[PDB]
Amino acid sequence: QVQLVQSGSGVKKPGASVRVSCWTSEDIFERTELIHWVRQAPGQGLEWIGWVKTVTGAVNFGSPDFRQRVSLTRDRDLFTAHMDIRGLTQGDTATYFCARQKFYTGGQGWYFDLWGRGTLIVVSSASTKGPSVFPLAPSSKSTSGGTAALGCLVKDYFPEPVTVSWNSGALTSGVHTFPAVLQSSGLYSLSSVVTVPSSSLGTQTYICNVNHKPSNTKVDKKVEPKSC
Amino acid sequence: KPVVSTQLLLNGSLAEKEIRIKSEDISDNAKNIIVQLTKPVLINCARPSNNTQYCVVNRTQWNDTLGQVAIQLRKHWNTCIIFNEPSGGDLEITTHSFNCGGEFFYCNTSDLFNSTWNIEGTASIDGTESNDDITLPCRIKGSGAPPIQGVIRCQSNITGILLTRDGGSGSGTCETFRPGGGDMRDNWRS
Amino acid sequence: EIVLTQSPGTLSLSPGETASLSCTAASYGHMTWYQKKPGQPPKLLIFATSKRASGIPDRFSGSQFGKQYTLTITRMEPEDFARYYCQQLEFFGQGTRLEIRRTVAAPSVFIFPPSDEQLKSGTASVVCLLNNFYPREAKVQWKVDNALQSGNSQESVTEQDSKDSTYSLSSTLTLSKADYEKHKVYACEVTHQGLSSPVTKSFNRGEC
Ligand SMILES: *[C@@H]1O[C@H](CO)[C@@H](O)[C@H](O)[C@H]1NC(C)=O
Ligand SMILES: *[C@@H]1O[C@H](CO)[C@@H](O)[C@H](O)[C@H]1NC(C)=O
Ligand SMILES: *[C@@H]1O[C@H](CO)[C@@H](O)[C@H](O)[C@H]1NC(C)=O
């Protein structure tokens, strides 16, 4: 279908600035009265940042803070909106969306039919670092009711994301890869577990496959029961 | 692509007995707020020499005008009303952009829109030291055009104002207004 | 101030049954509705208050009563389970989430002592796995020599499973290597609706 095309994601130092762009097809930009910018912090709602008019370049904002630190511009020739944020802070770590308002008569409300895929901006002080991958082996050592649980703890990596799969993909069932969590260090951490028939170990091997492209860090890690 | 949008409307129709606030939806901050004055404020612009242009507007008549406008806005939002210069935009909505005896003038309007009218009519925060009518600095637009050895003079009546109203929440107890705008197709019905 | 209050925050149904979300506005104003799945942008559902966006099934429906604007989804199909948002001009509601309703199922619990080689580096992580439970609300307390810890645990939850409609949770107690050695017994106590009394899984250092 029809897309609003959005500029790429970044990982920015606190205090630094950032431009997110949004462009589209002439036929579409012509039918467009306003381009709105909407953000979504993680585990949060949609927050309205502001708008720019395509015809006059007029603007408006959802908050004084925004009006101070955010600039909305357009190039009618390139059918393009730009959003510029300055003096970034952790409170700005969010996914930013551009979104479209067709020309409308007052009193219809605000409706946004087209939306960009959304740009993730991460504001953090930490440098790029590869995860260390520790194995959670068959626990007590077994068991909880004729079934064992095992997995990998992917610890201390930045920035997101990492992918984790099992047996190079053949094991998809019973897998649970959890949401990453953000430690106080500034680094992320992630668990992936899998529950398997406890009498299948010794008969089958369980290798977690971890990939972290920002570090070019790829690691296959075998999980086996305790030596004792 | 002609941009029909402005800050001040000149030499247009006047409302009959009081100011009129018009909008396709007043609650919609994205829709234009048009002000139709009832008694017009005169604005005289001129160019004495090279690199010297400005406009003059009586300060008192203007400020008294702004007040009467802030009361009409208060019929929709009963609080302190603020005017302020726009946070961004192209020339047409960032300045008073007009034709003066041929030339293209553009003057900034920062002193036309810088005030706060509190809940009681009493308005502006400081008692004013300046007694003189208001001076808007202008510039001309090229275009490399050969020099004009005349005194340029033009006389227009200010008829109305075009406004967008701030949105969001952290803004305080006030509704703030700026001379922004979108295009003005579909504006003349009454 | 509040202009929009969206409710409920979570609504549990089976496919087939009909869902209605509501959005109560402080001021009359045409209400807009969106669908939203993670990693996807919002999908426009309804605008004006009753108008249906292009290419949007007949089962979505925008109503109004007084200042209460509602969205109704009449014959729930599997794809409709997602978060929904209302928007009145520049303001968005806090969003309702549609979840699949199943029977209560208690978690199975597993505890994992830290890695041999993780311990070498100087840090220890104890993980606790709450598996395949419903409803979603579940509580994990750490205890060490029976002293209820705090500020050490990080917590994370899967989304609702494709097929059994359950949830799983992972809690990670992190301690400096030297802290770890001091105490003997490590346990995580789990409370859930499906457990009549709270469950504990323990282990101690050295023992396998
Ligand atoms: C305002 O007065 C001027 C004086 O020259 C006049 O030209 C103009 O027509 C008047 N405004 C209107 C609305 O006619
Ligand atoms: C005004 O000054 C001279 C007059 O000869 C003219 O050539 C020059 O371009 C003007 N200055 C400008 C446009 O800044
Ligand atoms: C404009 O200001 C002047 C100050 O010179 C004042 O005399 C006059 O009253 C004002 N204009 C009117 C009469 O509205």
XYZ file of C-alpha atoms and ligand atoms in Angstrom:
668
model
C 0.000 0.000 0.000
C 0.956 3.690 0.337
C 3.876 4.574 2.614
C 5.260 7.561 4.353
C 8.995 6.922 4.185
C 10.885 7.663 7.389
C 14.592 8.392 7.995
C 16.765 5.877 9.804
C 17.189 5.038 13.473
C 20.064 6.364 15.562
C 21.788 6.042 18.928
C 22.605 9.518 20.229
C 24.759 10.951 23.068
C 22.914 12.946 25.755
C 22.819 16.659 24.930
C 23.428 15.996 21.248
C 20.900 16.698 18.529
C 18.940 14.645 15.982
C 17.065 14.997 12.671
C 14.317 12.550 11.657
C 12.964 12.965 8.149
C 9.777 11.886 6.439
C 9.078 11.971 2.719
C 6.542 10.715 0.238
C 5.088 10.683 -3.265
C 4.085 14.022 -4.866
C 0.530 12.868 -5.464
C 0.278 12.024 -1.734
C 2.006 15.163 -0.412
C -0.355 17.284 -2.496
C -3.397 15.739 -0.730
C -1.731 16.478 2.660
C -2.630 19.435 4.904
C -0.409 18.667 7.884
C 2.342 16.372 8.878
C 2.163 15.385 12.540
C 4.898 13.931 14.681
C 3.867 11.418 17.343
C 6.157 9.591 19.740
C 5.904 6.520 21.910
C 8.237 5.904 24.817
C 8.678 2.197 25.531
C 5.798 0.729 27.554
C 3.912 3.934 27.072
C 1.233 5.737 25.159
C 1.314 7.786 22.035
C 2.267 11.408 22.804
C 1.597 14.191 20.255
C 4.684 16.316 19.580
C 3.565 18.829 16.964
C 2.658 19.591 13.403
C 3.801 21.411 10.328
C 1.567 22.654 7.541
C 2.710 21.641 4.081
C 1.441 24.810 2.395
C 2.716 27.582 4.748
C 5.207 25.823 6.983
C 3.269 26.910 10.046
C 3.842 24.935 13.268
C 2.341 24.007 16.644
C 3.424 21.904 19.645
C 2.023 19.775 22.414
C 4.276 21.216 25.070
C 6.498 24.240 25.859
C 9.458 21.867 26.221
C 8.780 20.550 22.687
C 8.275 24.067 21.251
C 11.657 25.081 22.674
C 13.739 22.038 21.659
C 11.924 20.827 18.519
C 11.861 22.330 15.013
C 9.411 21.240 12.303
C 10.143 22.168 8.685
C 9.130 21.068 5.203
C 10.487 21.169 1.701
C 7.459 21.288 -0.591
C 9.731 20.465 -3.562
C 10.976 17.181 -2.099
C 7.644 16.346 -0.471
C 9.452 16.063 2.862
C 8.940 16.823 6.523
C 11.882 17.208 8.907
C 11.789 17.019 12.718
C 14.810 18.335 14.587
C 15.436 17.663 18.256
C 18.166 19.420 20.193
C 19.496 18.962 23.700
C 18.426 15.344 23.858
C 17.801 13.514 27.128
C 16.881 10.006 28.242
C 13.258 11.153 28.340
C 13.494 11.348 24.569
C 14.284 7.669 24.119
C 11.210 6.640 22.167
C 9.907 5.616 18.808
C 9.042 8.585 16.649
C 6.307 8.474 14.043
C 5.424 10.824 11.205
C 1.732 10.777 10.260
C -0.565 12.434 7.793
C -3.662 14.582 7.880
C -5.642 14.909 4.624
C -7.146 18.379 4.047
C -10.292 18.461 6.236
C -13.126 20.785 7.215
C -13.071 21.991 10.826
C -14.939 19.757 13.241
C -13.991 16.374 11.854
C -11.285 15.974 14.449
C -7.793 14.700 13.914
C -7.475 11.537 11.854
C -4.156 10.159 10.617
C -4.614 7.649 7.748
C -0.976 7.186 6.721
C 1.895 6.635 9.165
C 5.602 5.969 8.793
C 7.195 2.721 9.986
C 8.575 4.740 12.884
C 12.117 5.694 13.860
C 13.700 4.430 17.062
C 15.962 6.936 18.773
C 18.010 5.782 21.733
C 19.587 8.348 24.055
C 22.328 6.789 26.164
C 25.858 7.530 27.349
C 27.112 3.965 26.994
C 29.417 2.809 24.168
C 28.775 -0.140 21.832
C 29.532 -3.379 23.687
C 29.105 -7.074 22.863
C 27.039 -9.379 25.097
C 28.560 -12.081 27.280
C 26.493 -15.270 26.981
C 26.070 -17.432 30.066
C 24.131 -20.709 29.986
C 21.349 -21.511 32.451
C 21.692 -25.305 32.681
C 19.074 -27.929 33.718
C 18.158 -26.466 37.050
C 17.362 -28.612 40.109
C 19.256 -30.217 38.349
C 15.897 -31.687 37.494
C 13.008 -31.353 37.613
C 9.635 -29.660 37.633
C 7.165 -32.381 36.689
C 8.877 -34.587 34.098
C 10.089 -31.569 32.073
C 13.348 -29.587 32.255
C 13.944 -25.923 31.602
C 17.185 -24.565 30.191
C 18.319 -21.429 28.372
C 20.851 -18.644 27.777
C 21.344 -15.468 29.765
C 22.587 -12.812 27.305
C 24.183 -10.196 29.577
C 25.567 -6.643 29.240
C 25.197 -5.492 25.625
C 24.496 -2.191 23.910
C 22.593 -1.165 22.030
C 19.556 -3.258 21.144
C 18.690 -5.578 19.489
C 20.002 -9.128 19.809
C 18.418 -12.134 18.173
C 18.316 -15.510 19.848
C 17.247 -18.796 18.248
C 17.507 -22.464 19.153
C 19.212 -25.225 17.185
C 19.588 -22.800 14.299
C 15.800 -22.575 14.032
C 14.606 -26.176 14.223
C 13.510 -25.708 17.834
C 10.772 -23.104 17.903
C 8.282 -24.701 20.231
C 8.535 -24.176 23.956
C 10.922 -21.299 23.401
C 10.484 -18.070 25.359
C 12.731 -15.110 24.523
C 12.046 -12.311 26.980
C 11.963 -8.543 26.592
C 15.365 -7.027 27.253
C 15.813 -5.068 30.463
C 17.930 -1.956 30.997
C 20.412 -2.197 33.902
C 21.793 0.791 35.849
C 25.126 0.439 34.052
C 23.392 1.547 30.888
C 23.634 -1.935 29.367
C 20.841 -4.292 28.380
C 20.274 -7.921 29.312
C 18.037 -10.675 27.992
C 16.999 -14.202 28.847
C 15.799 -16.962 26.598
C 14.539 -20.236 27.978
C 12.990 -23.362 26.547
C 11.167 -26.197 28.264
C 11.933 -29.690 27.026
C 11.075 -33.316 27.955
C 13.596 -34.055 30.726
C 14.494 -37.479 29.326
C 15.482 -35.902 26.021
C 18.819 -34.617 27.264
C 21.634 -37.015 26.612
C 19.644 -37.748 23.490
C 19.460 -34.183 22.148
C 21.676 -31.151 22.353
C 20.519 -27.649 22.978
C 22.410 -24.802 21.399
C 21.282 -21.196 21.734
C 22.297 -19.084 18.775
C 22.971 -15.453 19.712
C 23.567 -12.647 17.215
C 24.388 -9.012 18.006
C 24.988 -7.109 14.748
C 26.033 -3.807 16.342
C 29.052 -5.647 17.799
C 29.375 -8.017 14.858
C 29.109 -10.505 17.740
C 27.707 -13.933 16.849
C 27.809 -16.765 19.419
C 26.499 -20.349 19.475
C 26.444 -21.579 23.071
C 25.849 -25.164 24.154
C 23.763 -25.810 27.259
C 24.324 -29.012 29.202
C 23.487 -30.326 32.686
C 25.651 -29.741 35.737
C 28.953 -31.598 35.983
C 28.317 -32.802 39.547
C 2.200 27.915 -5.939
C 0.812 31.207 -4.532
C 0.625 31.102 -0.715
C -2.501 32.938 0.396
C -1.878 33.420 4.091
C -0.794 36.366 6.221
C -0.445 37.916 9.635
C -2.452 41.133 9.166
C -5.326 41.535 6.706
C -5.387 44.993 5.102
C -8.285 46.962 3.594
C -10.828 44.137 3.973
C -14.403 44.145 5.255
C -15.138 45.244 8.836
C -17.531 43.714 11.370
C -20.495 45.922 12.178
C -20.532 46.665 15.924
C -18.001 44.375 17.609
C -14.953 42.220 16.735
C -15.668 38.753 15.325
C -13.670 35.591 15.969
C -14.158 33.037 13.179
C -12.917 29.427 12.847
C -14.197 26.218 11.214
C -13.717 24.755 14.708
C -12.341 26.898 17.519
C -11.241 23.868 19.569
C -9.079 22.609 16.726
C -5.692 24.228 17.112
C -4.838 23.307 13.574
C -7.689 25.337 12.116
C -7.243 29.068 11.514
C -8.522 31.772 13.844
C -9.645 34.809 11.833
C -10.250 38.115 13.603
C -12.486 40.711 11.933
C -11.984 44.099 13.562
C -14.828 46.583 13.909
C -12.814 49.777 13.801
C -9.625 49.575 11.784
C -6.110 50.423 12.852
C -4.225 52.601 10.376
C -0.718 51.536 9.259
C 1.650 53.868 7.355
C 4.704 52.391 5.684
C 7.461 54.234 3.870
C 10.978 54.292 2.469
C 12.912 57.546 3.005
C 16.269 56.512 1.557
C 18.288 53.467 0.598
C 18.272 50.654 3.170
C 15.761 52.466 5.358
C 12.169 51.260 5.509
C 9.751 50.932 8.364
C 6.051 50.919 9.210
C 4.306 52.924 11.927
C 1.184 52.039 13.896
C -0.208 54.020 16.763
C 0.719 52.165 19.932
C -2.409 53.074 21.921
C -4.949 52.363 19.204
C -3.182 49.036 18.538
C -2.995 47.946 22.161
C -6.589 49.000 22.776
C -7.432 46.893 19.726
C -5.571 43.839 21.065
C -7.539 44.110 24.288
C -10.917 44.187 22.624
C -9.769 41.080 20.782
C -8.646 39.335 23.967
C -12.102 39.898 25.420
C -13.771 38.193 22.409
C -11.375 35.256 22.688
C -12.264 35.014 26.365
C -15.800 34.174 25.349
C -14.313 30.777 24.292
C -11.520 30.405 26.868
C -12.129 32.470 29.957
C -8.545 33.105 31.081
C -5.509 35.257 30.579
C -4.864 35.537 26.809
C -1.350 35.900 25.412
C -0.088 37.079 22.033
C 3.321 35.988 20.849
C 5.407 35.837 17.669
C 5.360 32.566 15.654
C 7.763 29.731 16.480
C 8.411 29.000 12.776
C 7.090 29.332 9.210
C 7.736 30.940 5.820
C 7.946 34.699 5.210
C 4.215 35.128 4.596
C 3.289 34.104 8.113
C 6.493 35.053 9.910
C 6.249 38.692 8.896
C 4.011 41.398 7.583
C 4.619 40.797 3.874
C 3.053 43.449 1.701
C 3.243 45.532 -1.487
C 4.152 49.215 -1.000
C 3.878 51.381 -4.107
C 5.290 48.515 -6.125
C 8.051 47.258 -3.842
C 7.942 44.053 -1.762
C 8.188 44.963 1.896
C 8.598 42.571 4.752
C 8.596 43.841 8.312
C 8.834 41.855 11.522
C 5.953 42.175 13.907
C 7.601 41.228 17.194
C 6.328 44.324 18.954
C 2.803 43.993 17.620
C 2.441 40.593 19.279
C 4.153 40.642 22.645
C 1.737 41.019 25.527
C -0.311 39.261 28.226
C -3.931 40.222 29.043
C -4.727 38.899 32.534
C -8.088 37.637 33.854
C -9.261 41.105 34.907
C -9.065 43.291 31.808
C -5.993 45.008 33.316
C -3.621 43.217 31.025
C -0.035 44.021 30.322
C 2.420 43.235 33.089
C 4.590 46.388 33.101
C 3.394 49.985 33.010
C 4.832 51.308 29.749
C 7.746 53.757 29.604
C 7.344 54.275 25.839
C 4.813 56.884 24.710
C 5.447 56.827 20.965
C 3.563 54.936 18.252
C 5.047 51.549 17.232
C 7.903 51.181 14.705
C 8.165 48.054 12.584
C 11.526 47.631 10.797
C 11.309 46.457 7.154
C 13.484 45.025 4.392
C 12.894 44.949 0.629
C 13.276 42.037 -1.762
C 15.884 42.761 -4.459
C 15.627 41.605 -7.036
C 18.742 43.446 -8.109
C 16.024 45.792 -9.329
C 17.420 49.206 -10.433
C 17.475 51.917 -7.712
C 14.393 54.067 -7.023
C 15.084 57.768 -6.429
C 11.729 58.525 -4.877
C 10.199 58.471 -1.436
C 8.028 55.382 -1.236
C 4.768 55.885 0.696
C 1.723 53.677 1.178
C -1.336 53.884 3.389
C -3.346 50.841 4.494
C -6.038 50.209 7.142
C -5.613 47.075 9.278
C -8.857 45.112 8.975
C -8.237 41.797 10.687
C -5.696 39.303 12.040
C -4.984 35.626 11.383
C -4.077 33.468 14.388
C -3.219 29.894 15.379
C -3.609 28.929 19.054
C -0.977 26.933 21.004
C -1.811 23.295 21.761
C -0.892 20.782 24.427
C -0.988 21.073 28.196
C 2.128 22.148 30.104
C 1.393 25.648 28.740
C -0.032 26.988 32.035
C -3.390 28.652 32.746
C -3.160 30.711 29.643
C -4.274 30.336 26.071
C -1.447 31.685 23.834
C -2.026 33.006 20.282
C 0.398 33.647 17.393
C -0.029 35.121 13.879
C 0.540 31.812 12.085
C -1.732 30.314 9.464
C -2.641 27.837 6.792
C -3.983 28.670 3.339
C -7.269 30.562 3.270
C -9.489 28.726 0.794
C -13.099 28.894 1.996
C -13.122 31.987 4.272
C -15.807 34.421 3.079
C -19.227 33.041 4.126
C -21.290 34.818 6.816
C -5.744 18.103 33.287
C -7.535 15.132 31.762
C -9.434 15.465 28.553
C -9.600 11.760 27.795
C -10.082 8.737 29.971
C -10.030 5.373 28.246
C -11.443 2.194 29.847
C -11.027 -0.624 30.640
C -7.232 -0.906 30.598
C -7.369 -4.610 29.889
C -10.337 -6.514 28.517
C -10.323 -10.301 28.226
C -12.471 -12.070 25.601
C -12.752 -15.234 23.461
C -12.882 -14.869 19.659
C -16.515 -14.606 18.597
C -17.654 -12.608 21.625
C -17.948 -8.887 21.035
C -15.700 -6.258 22.594
C -16.554 -2.635 23.378
C -13.955 -0.119 24.453
C -15.063 3.301 25.584
C -13.391 6.684 25.748
C -14.993 9.381 27.931
C -14.092 12.921 26.854
C -14.323 16.058 29.003
C -15.617 18.005 25.997
C -17.785 17.120 23.007
C -15.548 16.497 20.038
C -15.399 13.917 17.279
C -13.475 10.837 18.403
C -10.865 8.950 16.377
C -9.811 5.323 17.017
C -6.620 3.365 16.214
C -5.443 -0.217 16.387
C -1.850 -0.801 17.479
C 0.365 -3.864 17.460
C 3.981 -3.797 18.671
C 6.580 -3.049 16.020
C 3.816 -1.746 13.840
C 2.553 1.822 13.430
C -1.012 2.643 14.428
C -3.815 1.527 12.068
C -6.648 4.060 11.619
C -9.950 2.406 12.450
C -12.679 5.008 12.880
C -12.858 8.801 12.415
C -15.526 11.489 12.723
C -17.088 9.350 15.381
C -18.798 6.658 13.275
C -16.939 6.793 9.957
C -14.977 3.710 8.989
C -11.496 4.103 7.529
C -10.773 2.684 4.091
C -10.224 -1.077 3.977
C -11.500 -1.705 7.489
C -13.838 -4.676 8.108
C -17.547 -4.075 8.850
C -17.242 -5.455 12.379
C -15.543 -2.277 13.665
C -17.985 0.389 14.781
C -17.847 3.875 16.288
C -20.698 4.989 18.553
C -21.433 7.965 20.784
C -23.560 8.736 23.865
C -23.178 12.095 25.507
C -19.453 12.566 26.056
C -18.861 8.802 26.031
C -17.379 7.626 22.739
C -17.097 3.893 22.188
C -15.586 1.451 19.737
C -17.296 -1.919 19.193
C -15.738 -5.007 17.597
C -18.612 -7.375 16.934
C -17.353 -10.795 15.870
C -13.840 -10.951 17.236
C -11.318 -12.587 14.941
C -7.788 -13.517 16.138
C -6.093 -10.484 14.556
C -8.129 -8.023 16.603
C -6.340 -8.837 19.821
C -4.086 -5.775 20.116
C -3.966 -2.409 21.924
C -6.525 0.227 20.942
C -6.227 4.023 21.252
C -8.677 6.896 20.997
C -7.689 10.331 19.851
C -9.582 13.547 20.314
C -7.614 16.288 18.501
C -4.092 16.458 19.980
C -4.920 14.107 22.875
C -4.686 10.338 23.022
C -6.330 8.052 25.514
C -4.118 5.801 27.637
C -5.232 2.759 25.617
C -7.162 -0.478 26.133
C -5.512 -3.868 25.480
C -7.474 -6.846 24.186
C -6.281 -10.132 25.595
C -7.504 -13.701 25.098
C -9.499 -15.222 27.968
C -8.564 -18.717 29.115
C -8.851 -20.623 32.421
C -6.563 -19.930 35.364
C -3.349 -21.846 35.111
C -0.622 -21.652 37.751
C 2.998 -21.078 36.788
C 5.603 -23.780 36.774
C 8.684 -22.333 38.592
C 12.402 -22.936 37.900
C 15.467 -21.466 39.582
C 18.951 -21.242 37.987
C 22.179 -20.748 39.980
C 24.741 -18.434 38.257
C 27.189 -19.659 35.582
C 30.534 -21.178 36.444
C 32.349 -18.810 34.092
C 30.087 -15.854 34.785
C 31.311 -16.132 38.344
C 34.897 -15.899 37.111
C 34.377 -12.381 35.744
C 33.168 -11.252 39.172
C 29.387 -10.938 38.863
C 26.597 -13.403 39.696
C 23.101 -13.645 38.250
C 20.360 -15.800 39.702
C 17.424 -16.309 37.348
C 13.892 -17.443 38.230
C 11.426 -18.676 35.578
C 7.646 -18.519 35.938
C 6.291 -20.512 33.079
C 3.022 -20.772 31.214
C 0.643 -19.076 33.577
C -2.619 -17.130 33.323
C -3.896 -14.602 34.252
C -0.942 -12.294 33.704
C -0.633 -10.782 37.194
C 2.120 -12.562 39.158
C 4.494 -11.588 41.951
C 8.088 -12.654 42.564
C 9.865 -12.048 45.849
C 13.548 -12.899 46.304
C 14.854 -14.167 49.663
C 18.444 -14.879 50.735
C 19.039 -16.639 54.072
C 15.371 -15.587 54.398
C 15.931 -11.836 54.060
C 13.516 -10.418 51.487
C 15.779 -8.616 48.998
C 15.048 -5.410 47.082
C 16.524 -3.282 44.288
C 18.457 -6.276 42.975
C 15.860 -7.916 40.771
C 15.035 -7.108 37.164
C 11.830 -8.450 35.674
C 10.466 -9.083 32.168
C 7.379 -10.738 30.622
C 6.534 -12.463 27.330
C 3.456 -11.508 25.351
C 0.403 -13.748 25.355
C 1.258 -17.036 23.631
C 0.098 -17.799 20.097
C -1.625 -21.038 21.127
C -2.074 -21.739 24.867
C -2.727 -18.038 25.609
C -0.447 -18.033 28.651
C 2.356 -15.775 29.912
C 5.869 -16.367 31.166
C 8.087 -14.253 33.395
C 11.795 -14.018 34.141
C 13.239 -12.391 37.280
C 16.975 -11.788 37.671
C 18.676 -11.131 41.011
C 22.136 -9.652 40.433
C 24.881 -9.571 43.074
C 28.619 -8.861 43.202
C 30.691 -12.076 43.470
C 31.790 -11.338 47.041
C 28.229 -10.694 48.207
C 27.116 -13.992 46.721
C 29.609 -16.054 48.770
C 28.540 -14.651 52.152
C 25.105 -16.292 52.301
C 24.036 -19.900 51.865
C 20.400 -20.368 50.792
C 18.874 -18.606 47.756
C 15.159 -18.738 46.956
C 12.441 -17.047 44.955
C 8.912 -17.052 46.359
C 6.182 -16.866 43.743
C 2.619 -15.731 44.269
C -0.108 -16.374 41.719
C -3.863 -16.700 41.451
C -3.451 -20.328 40.514
C -1.436 -21.124 43.620
C -3.446 -21.606 46.806
C -0.324 -21.009 48.910
C 2.831 -19.224 47.661
C 5.487 -21.440 45.992
C 9.240 -21.360 46.674
C 12.172 -22.786 44.716
C 15.544 -22.851 46.458
C 19.149 -23.853 46.152
C 22.400 -23.336 48.045
C 25.985 -22.689 46.976
C 28.295 -25.572 46.142
C 25.517 -28.141 46.187
C 24.439 -29.118 42.690
C -8.886 52.618 4.968
O -8.533 53.966 4.662
C -7.784 54.056 3.452
C -7.300 55.489 3.260
O -6.573 55.585 2.030
C -8.655 53.612 2.282
O -7.882 53.633 1.077
C -9.203 52.209 2.510
O -10.190 51.914 1.514
C -9.827 52.084 3.895
N -10.152 50.697 4.168
C -11.184 50.097 3.581
C -11.678 48.850 4.251
O -11.695 50.533 2.563
C 21.369 50.494 -1.446
O 22.566 51.233 -1.676
C 23.053 51.290 -3.013
C 22.642 52.599 -3.687
O 23.409 52.784 -4.857
C 22.599 50.076 -3.823
O 23.447 49.898 -4.939
C 22.611 48.849 -2.913
O 22.343 47.673 -3.648
C 21.557 49.009 -1.818
N 21.887 48.162 -0.671
C 21.351 46.954 -0.425
C 20.395 46.376 -1.432
O 21.618 46.306 0.591
C -1.502 57.056 19.568
O -0.450 57.458 20.436
C -0.358 58.875 20.493
C 0.935 59.288 21.186
O 1.606 60.284 20.405
C -1.564 59.393 21.253
O -1.513 60.822 21.286
C -2.865 58.959 20.594
O -3.918 59.097 21.551
C -2.854 57.517 20.099
N -3.839 57.379 19.046
C -5.141 57.447 19.294
C -5.687 58.824 19.522
O -5.845 56.454 19.331
